[PDB]
């Protein structure tokens, strides 16, 4: 003699894929600054749940795809309305820079002249700029001239790595996994529900993960499949390591009028002696972190198995080097001096034409930056592959994994407040 | 109002039923509701969809004659084929998550029987004048 | 329907209470609801926001057990600390604008106490069967 009773506001949920919305940090054309999410701050909206063990899987987390999708969209929106350097896709007459250049810089700098347009469509002007060899091809020409359109990044737009917070839309909630030493998948006995996530900086890099979070206790090593040599392995350090990168050669830039309201920024002569870019790593801490990684790798590969670290062999800059972005300049640094050990000065190169995500070109043309650059970052993690004694090398992957490494603690579910149960009550 | 919310889920259905307003009060406003059409259009789309979801559940309660209140008695008997547990067994030992899974198979059937409120309204008019 | 609207505000709360539907009937349709995405998008955004505002107030009334009707008795006693006037003093000498300012300080407190309708619903089920 039981009856159907309808209940509304029932605390149940199911996995779902929805759009999460960003939130800003208040405190001004720094990209995120225009595409503001509206500031939040007093939002420590965290509730502990008892029991209700739930499962997580960081390699199936759709939030990663959203981060990728919107950051790339915003990148284009911020840089679309700029100059479009059609007139620079011309023949270059180049010579060598003969200034006081060290051995490590020989062949790196070219002095090139060309016939540039003017604001008055009758006349041409003779213009020259210094160029780096990685962006120039001998036939000379700009290296991407025969492939796709080239632009110039707006000089007032700065893609600063400002942390962005994400929050659920109404009808949704985010479950945060607090399990200590969680390896990225399966049941998480300790979960809390939140309104929003902590902030994540949109740092794009290769090989080493910079300025992210640190592991709570131990160095964590996780991958979709530990024994699959076709997969990338994510290593999170419990101790930060500083890396000091510099760009020497104090310089200036010239503002060249190229059309009626259009300006190009040229690279001027170097003040003082000419040296290469480079990075400094403390050998003491590099040795410690690799030893810690090995101690943990041995858990799955054998503690009687010798583990070696080796160079990032591959076919290109975006594959073999450590990519950084400091001061608006793009660096491609040599890490072969780090991954050389069986169980520190790193020379570095720079470029102005950056494809970023391959596609068709984009070619934002990082403008020349005046003065010098000093940049110090926190190494918080590492991505490795194995070749199979076993050997590990710096790995690959898209920017997606520079999100996944932070996003792994959060999952979003859909709330379904209406349902029924038997009671003894009849209308 | 995350003063309390889905934490109710840690206990039994009986206990959880005493705090139903705790979740209801958190269903209409996301962060974008507290606060270049590129990118920003997504916030507009999300707000609209949230509204639609809310209204669909309210419409269903309206149709069943259960609009208003948290708990609605239906005058539709419970089928013996839907579950085989003591009433007190489900209210004291089961959670709502477990319950929802157990009777998922009968969702449409149960809802279809809530159409009976229409027959009740016709009877009520005839004897009401 | 500007046949009459906020003109009720010129008088006392008592008098104004007799014409509450006068304002309610004017809350869902702006000029854009009677009637190149550039510029026009603003009309779409405004219509959506108007809907959201409406629903949030309706949801609050739903939660309090006051959904439906213009006037709802709550069974929650009035605190002596909220005001110190004769009941007839406020209804005959004060306007709603004045009143809203006078007790603004207690808005959240009063609303928090309207959660008691949840306890009433649990009691009602137990003694209803």
């Amino acid at each position, epitope marked *: 003699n039981l009856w159907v009773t309808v209940y509304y506001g029932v605390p149940v949920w199911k996995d779902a894929e929805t759009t999460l919305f960003c939130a800003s940090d208040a405190k001004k054309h720094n990209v995120w600054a225009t595409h503001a999410c509206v500031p939040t701050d007093p939002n*420590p909206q*965290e509730i*502990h749940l*008892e029991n209700v063990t739930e499962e997580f899987n960081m390699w199936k987390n759709n939030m990663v795809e959203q981060m990728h999708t919107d950051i790339i969209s915003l990148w284009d929106q911020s840089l679309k309305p700029c100059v479009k350097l059609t007139p620079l896709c011309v023949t270059l007459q180049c010579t060598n820079v003969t200034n006081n250049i060290t051995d490590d810089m020989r062949g790196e700098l070219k002095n090139c002249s060309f016939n540039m347009t003017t604001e008055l469509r009758d006349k041409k002007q003779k213009v020259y700029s210094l160029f780096y060899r990685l962006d120039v091809v001998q036939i000379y020409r700009l290296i991407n001239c025969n492939t796709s359109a080239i632009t110039q990044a707006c000089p007032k737009v700065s893609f600063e790595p400002i942390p962005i917070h994400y929050c659920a839309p109404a009808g949704f909630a985010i479950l945060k996994c607090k399990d200590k030493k969680f390896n990225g998948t399966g049941p998480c006995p300790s979960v809390s529900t939140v309104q929003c996530t902590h902030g994540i900086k949109p740092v794009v890099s290769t090989q080493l993960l910079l300025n992210g979070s640190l592991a709570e206790e131990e160095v964590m090593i996780r991958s979709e499949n530990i024994t699959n040599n076709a997969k990338n392995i994510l290593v999170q350090f419990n101790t930060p390591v500083q890396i000091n990168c510099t760009r020497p050669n104090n310089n200036t830039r010239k503002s060249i009028r190229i059309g009626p309201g259009q300006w190009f920024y040229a690279t001027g002569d170097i003040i003082g002696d000419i040296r290469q870019a480079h990075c400094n790593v403390s050998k003491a801490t590099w040795n410690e972190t690799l030893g810690k990684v090995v101690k943990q790798l041995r858990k799955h590969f054998g503690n009687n198995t010798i583990i070696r670290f080796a160079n990032s062999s591959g076919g290109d800059l975006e594959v073999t080097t450590h990519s950084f972005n400091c001061g608006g300049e793009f660096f491609y640094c040599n890490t072969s001096g780090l991954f050389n050990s069986t169980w520190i000065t790193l020379p570095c190169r720079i470029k102005q034409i950056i494809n970023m995500w391959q596609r068709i070109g984009q070619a934002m043309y990082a403008p020349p930056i005046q003065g010098v650059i000093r940049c110090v970052s926190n190494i918080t993690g590492l991505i490795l592959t194995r070749d199979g004694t076993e050997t590990f090398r710096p790995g690959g992957g898209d920017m997606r994994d520079n999100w996944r490494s932070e996003l792994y603690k959060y999952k979003v579910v859909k709330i379904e407040p209406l349902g029924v149960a038997p009671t003894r009550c009849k209308r | *109002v995350f003063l309390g919310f889905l*934490g109710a889920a840690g206990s039994t259905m009986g206990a959880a039923s*005493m705090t139903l307003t*705790v979740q209801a009060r958190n269903l209409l406003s996301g962060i974008v509701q507290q606060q270049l059409t590129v990118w920003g259009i997504k916030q507009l789309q999300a707000r609209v969809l949230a509204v639609e979801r809310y209204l669909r559940d309210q419409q269903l309660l309206g149709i069943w004659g259960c609009s208003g209140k948290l708990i609605c008695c239906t005058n539709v008997p419970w089928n013996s084929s839907w579950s085989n547990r003591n009433l007190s067994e489900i209210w004291d030992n089961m959670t709502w998550l477990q319950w929802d899974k157990e009777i998922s198979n009968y969702t449409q059937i149960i809802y279809g029987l809530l159409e009976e409120s229409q027959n009740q309204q016709e009877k009520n008019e005839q004897d009401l004048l | 329907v500007f046949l009459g609207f906020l003109g009720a505000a010129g008088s006392t709360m008592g008098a104004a209470s007799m014409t509450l539907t006068v304002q309610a009937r004017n809350l869902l349709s702006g000029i854009v609801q009677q009637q190149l995405t550039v510029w026009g998008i603003k009309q779409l955004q405004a219509r959506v926001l108007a809907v959201e505002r409406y629903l949030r107030d309706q949801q609050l009334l739903g939660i309090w057990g006051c959904s439906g009707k213009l006037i709802c008795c709550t069974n929650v006693p009035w605190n002596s600390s909220w005001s110190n006037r004769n009941l007839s003093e406020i209804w005959d000498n004060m306007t709603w604008l004045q009143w809203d300012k006078e007790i603004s300080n207690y808005t959240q407190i009063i609303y928090g106490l309207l959660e008691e309708s949840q306890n009433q619903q649990e009691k009602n089920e137990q003694d209803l069967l």
Partner: antibody
Amino acid sequence: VQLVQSGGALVQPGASLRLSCAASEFSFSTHDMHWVRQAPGKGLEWVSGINIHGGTYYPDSVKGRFTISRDSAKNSLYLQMSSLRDGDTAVYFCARGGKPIYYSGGYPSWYFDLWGPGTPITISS
Amino acid sequence: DVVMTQSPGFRSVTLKEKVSITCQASQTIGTNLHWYQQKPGQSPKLLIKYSSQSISGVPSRFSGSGSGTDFTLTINSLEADDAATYYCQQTNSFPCTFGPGTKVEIK
């Protein structure tokens, strides 16, 4: 108003013990109640708690060994502990959870307005 | 977990001095910090809640503020009766946690 407490005790390792508190001049049925313990030289470790609807919360440091219960009829609280260790030596206290800023349902505020006098337990051979 | 620390371990103060001690969190706790005091042989007492709210029964000379990871407790003019060990607790993230305490000795 106070939390009236039982006296202290000495037990052997592996022993079980029941502690209790009572509500003087108030009802326990209107408050979330918690137990904490103060080991010599330490601050207050939260041990357990029960909400107004009978739901409970436990630390992983005691979960499976400690149980919290309430009997509102007599205005009493209990803490039942099994398999006690020397490391569990502490002064045990009951405390009345502080009033929350806004309604949460049976979800504690995790801070306290009312503290009892303290009941020491020594576990030793 | 939220790790809470306090500084100094103890403070040596004298009467009618304006004094202060601080608390820190390893991670942001918003404004969910509460201050307590305890005297030897006594049960604990709560003095300040939610970073800056007053509590009836607590003298007006006690005040404080803070957010995120950094909080301060102060006494406008120290009294002999204020000797105590002062403690911070956080309620932002479960398990609830507390710091080691700062002892205030009065001369």
